Design a protein around this ligand. Structure first.
Ligand code: CLA
Ligand code: CLA
Ligand code: CLA
Ligand code: CLA
Ligand code: CLA
Ligand code: CLA
Ligand code: CLA
Ligand code: LHG
Ligand code: KC2
Ligand code: II0
Ligand code: II0
Lengths: 177, 92, 173
């Protein structure tokens, strides 16, 4: 009954309401966990991974003037960079998390207010005016976030293996070994 | 009398017996196997397990995995022949 | 009864419903367990073994560029052993394990009666629509898979005896 895994029954929780649903839950996580919590996690992972993948790609080509910020490899850059700045980013991200969630950062309490999953109210330029455009943007954001999760995973692991940046690794494939 | 009901696994049947032999639901997946099948299985398992055990009695530092596996048929043959007796006295 | 073995009674579990059912179960292995489970296993083995036989012949005939350097003169299980070190067999194992986790979900559905054994709804080119066709193609699949299980056993064991791949063996003998 699923549309993604045609030989498996459609997950009961997935009924086509949330955007991006193709009836893909072969392992039954939706029955065990709240779908709103799962979608919040999915969109957060996708957004962080989108930012991360663009970050690696831009990092390897554009660098800050300082020597501590001139590593084409993202993995190596993490350690070459000062630790104080990394911890500052950690704390600022934590503050942003707290404020955006409203201090309701738990599985039980996050959606007590009733805000839709993935909606932290961040739309400064107001690009969500048109409802149809907003639906298209929601599906595009989900798809691009999933793509970015997988892509950044590939980038970081290929950086571990090759020891080079993403596109340097891509263009320096060793065809003769 | 106020105790909560005891949960038991799915498809749990009544296996208590005061007859000459249990009800063949005791044999589970092999409930529909024939008594002749159980007899032949028990004899074959006994012979193979005894042979594979004899091939390993003076255990070396590199015993044969297949002989180790087959040696477990001697214990298996006992259950097989018990099942044979159960299945002969239950109509099969 | 038992058309296949005329001197034995027709297997109790086998009623002739399933494709390729000639009442063949001399040892009564269908009485133990669920016949749906055994049919899923049989179709898995059929498809895997016929892929394996075609692959043995095709590796004997052609090899991809640059594989000769890695495997040397290895054939069959020797190729396996050689490329486990390289990592090819590991990647195949990872991806097959993914597919097999999803096939585990499929088997659990089959045992509940939701899924027909061996049906993964994989029909891209759309061959099986004419219910008649699918009914023939199912019999052909079962028969070819059985023949292929036997053929791959023969190929591997001929390699064991002689050290030669199937067609290389057949050429010289
Ligand atoms: C952590 C990230 C994450 C999260 C929280 C979710 C959450 C969700 N996804 Mg999923 N999704 C993700 C990543 C994620 N997704 C990625 C990267 C892709 C691209 C392939 C998709 C593609 C996708 C589609 C196409 C659909 C969903 C849907 C859903 C929803 C229902 C299914 C479910 O319960 O998933 C929960 C899943 C998890 C919590 C992940 C569990 C991971 C396990 C424990 C280990 C995985 C290990 C490794 C990565 C797997 C490979 C192993 C290999 C080495 C052999 C749910 C909101 C459906 C939807 O929209 O429903 C409303 C839907 O149709 N997702
Ligand atoms: C969200 C993921 C993410 C993470 C974890 C990091 C982490 C890092 N980046 Mg940044 N970076 C990101 C996204 C990210 N970046 C994006 C999206 C861009 C493009 C605008 C950049 C562009 C960028 C440059 C040009 C440089 C770094 C560098 C660094 C390192 C030092 C901190 C710094 O100067 O950041 C700066 C962060 C920004 C300019 C964008 C923050 C907003 C999101 C650190 C490992 C430095 C480094 O060591 O490079 C190897 C460096 O020179 N990043
Ligand atoms: C709250 C205000 C605040 C304050 C007082 C500082 C202060 C500092 N930051 Mg900065 N920083 C801020 C916000 C702030 N930051 C924010 C919002 C971010 C993005 C999350 C960063 C990310 C950042 C990084 C990544 C780094 C600094 C670093 C520094 C130090 C040198 C640069 C400077 O003069 O400024 C200095 C102690 C550098 C350092 O060496 O810190 C120890 C450094 O590497 N900051
Ligand atoms: C240090 C402060 C801080 C705080 C208070 C939180 C708080 C939270 N994070 Mg986390 N998070 C942090 C830093 C922090 N994060 C950092 C530095 C990152 C890396 C960018 C992330 C990346 C991250 C992801 C990708 C996800 C969370 C999620 C969560 C939520 C559930 C966490 C849990 O225990 O389950 C919660 C709102 C999960 C969430 O929102 O679930 C709905 C989730 O998916 N966080
Ligand atoms: C969409 C995301 C994405 C993309 C574009 C890539 C792209 C790449 N990965 Mg992969 N990778 C990804 C996700 C991704 N990865 C993820 C999620 C993981 C898990 C952590 C990995 C883990 C991984 C490893 C461990 C390695 C790569 C490597 C590579 C490179 C060669 C792979 C190859 O040709 O395999 C060969 C096989 C095929 C192309 C057949 C594909 C299958 C059918 C035919 C389609 C290539 C640039 C390799 C590399 O960089 O080597 C130095 C490498 O070793 N990746
Ligand atoms: C049981 C199935 C099976 C198994 C376990 C293997 C295993 C192996 N094959 Mg493969 N192979 C198979 C079937 C199989 N093959 C089939 C059916 C063919 C004919 C197309 C080939 C053709 C083939 C060649 C030409 C070569 C290998 C080689 C190898 C080795 C490395 C992997 C590789 O490069 O594969 C490459 C195989 C392919 C890209 C084709 C796979 C097609 C799949 C099985 C069908 C998918 C159907 C689709 C869903 C519709 C490895 C021992 C290499 C080797 O070392 O040879 C000695 C090699 O050079 N195989
Ligand atoms: C349909 C499948 C099939 C086919 C076509 C073959 C074909 C072959 N096998 Mg056999 N083989 C098979 C299945 C198959 N095998 C299986 C499933 C196994 C696993 C037990 C084996 C194990 C096996 C071994 C161990 C050997 C062969 C050998 C051979 C070759 C010579 C056999 C011979 O002369 O027998 C003669 C048969 C008879 C005389 C019986 C006919 C009696 C008449 C009808 C009366 C030949 C190419 C031999 C070989 O390659 O030698 C170098 C060999 O040693 N096969
Ligand atoms: C020994 C170590 C065992 C700890 C593993 C814990 C993983 C829990 C993982 C877990 O189940 O968390 C999932 C949970 C969200 O799940 P639900 O939304 O179903 O709510 C959890 C409960 O409210 C219901 O069980 O996450 C949170 O509540 C945030 C805190 C984490
Ligand atoms: C068409 C698709 C294709 C497939 C499916 C495939 C599969 C495998 C497998 C299977 C798991 C292994 C193990 C393997 C190994 C090697 N491949 Mg190969 N390969 C393909 C294509 C090419 C091309 C175009 C080239 C190439 C090469 C090499 C070299 C280099 C050795 C050296 O130069 O020392 C090695 C070791 C390069 C070469 O030298 O070819 C003359 C080269 O250019 N391959 N290749
Ligand atoms: C929130 C919001 C806004 C916004 C916004 C913003 C800033 C949105 C930013 C979105 C971004 C940055 C999206 C990035 C997506 C990246 C992807 C999918 C990467 C995939 C990589 C892959 C597959 C790869 C790879 C690779 C691998 C693995 C290995 C490598 O060797 C090779 C290779 C490179 C090929 C605005 C400002 C408009 C306001 C509005 O009110 C709403
Ligand atoms: C279903 C489906 C599709 C599909 C598909 C695919 C990819 C189907 C593939 C089917 C295959 C690969 C079938 C292979 C059968 C092989 C056999 C029967 C071998 C027997 C060997 C023997 C007897 C032997 C032997 C031998 C022995 C033992 C001794 C040796 O010395 C040599 C010797 C040779 C003599 C498509 C793509 C159309 C799409 C569609 O929408 C869905």
């Amino acid at each position: 009954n699923s549309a993604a895994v045609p030989f498996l029954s459609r997950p009961a929780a997935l009924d086509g309401s949330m955007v991006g649903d193709v009836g893909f839950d072969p392992l039954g996580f939706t029955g065990k966990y709240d779908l709103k919590w799962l979608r919040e996690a999915e969109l957060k992972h996708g957004r962080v991974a989108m930012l991360a993948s663009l970050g690696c790609l831009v990092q390897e080509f554009i660098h800050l003037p300082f020597e501590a910020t001139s590593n084409p490899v993202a993995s190596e850059a993490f350690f070459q960079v000062p630790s104080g700045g990394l911890w500052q980013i950690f704390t600022v991200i934590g503050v942003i998390e707290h404020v955006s969630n409203g201090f309701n950062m738990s599985g039980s309490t996050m959606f007590k207010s009733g805000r839709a999953p993935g909606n932290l109210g961040f739309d400064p330029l107001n690009f969500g005016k048109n409802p149809t455009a907003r639906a298209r943007y929601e599906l595009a954001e989900l798809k691009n976030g999933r793509l970015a999760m997988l892509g950044f995973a590939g980038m970081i692991h290929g950086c571990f293996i090759t020891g080079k940046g993403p596109l340097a690794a891509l263009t320096s494939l060793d065809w003769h070994q | 009398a106020g105790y909560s009901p005891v949960p038991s696994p799915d498809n749990t049947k009544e296996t208590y017996w005061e007859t000459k032999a249990p009800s063949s639901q005791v044999l589970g997946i092999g409930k529909d196997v024939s008594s002749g099948n159980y007899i032949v299985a028990s004899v074959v398992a006994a012979v193979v397990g005894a042979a594979c055990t004899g091939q390993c009695i003076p255990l070396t530092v590199s015993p044969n995995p297949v002989f180790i596996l087959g040696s477990f048929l001697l214990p298996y043959s006992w259950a097989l022949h018990v099942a044979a007796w159960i299945q002969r006295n239950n109509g099969k | 009864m038992s058309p296949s073995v005329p001197f034995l009674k027709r297997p109790v579990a086998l009623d002739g419903s399933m494709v390729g059912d000639v009442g063949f179960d001399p040892l009564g292995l269908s009485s133990v367990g669920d016949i749906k489970f055994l049919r899923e296993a049989e179709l898995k083995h059929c498809r895997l073994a016929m892929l394996a036989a075609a692959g043995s012949m095709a590796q004997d005939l052609y090899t991809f560029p640059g594989v000769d350097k890695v495997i040397g003169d290895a054939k069959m299980t020797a190729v396996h052993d050689k490329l486990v070190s390289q990592g090819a067999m590991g990647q195949l194992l990872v991806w097959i394990g993914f597919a097999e986790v999803f096939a585990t979900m499929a088997l659990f559905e089959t045992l509940d009666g939701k899924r027909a054994p061996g049906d993964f709804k994989f029909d891209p080119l759309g061959f099986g629509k004419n219910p008649e066709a699918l009914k023939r193609y199912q019999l052909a699949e079962i028969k070819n898979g059985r023949l292929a299980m036997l053929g791959f056993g023969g190929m591997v064991h001929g390699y064991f005896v002689t050290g030669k791949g199937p067609l290389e063996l057949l050429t010289n003998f």
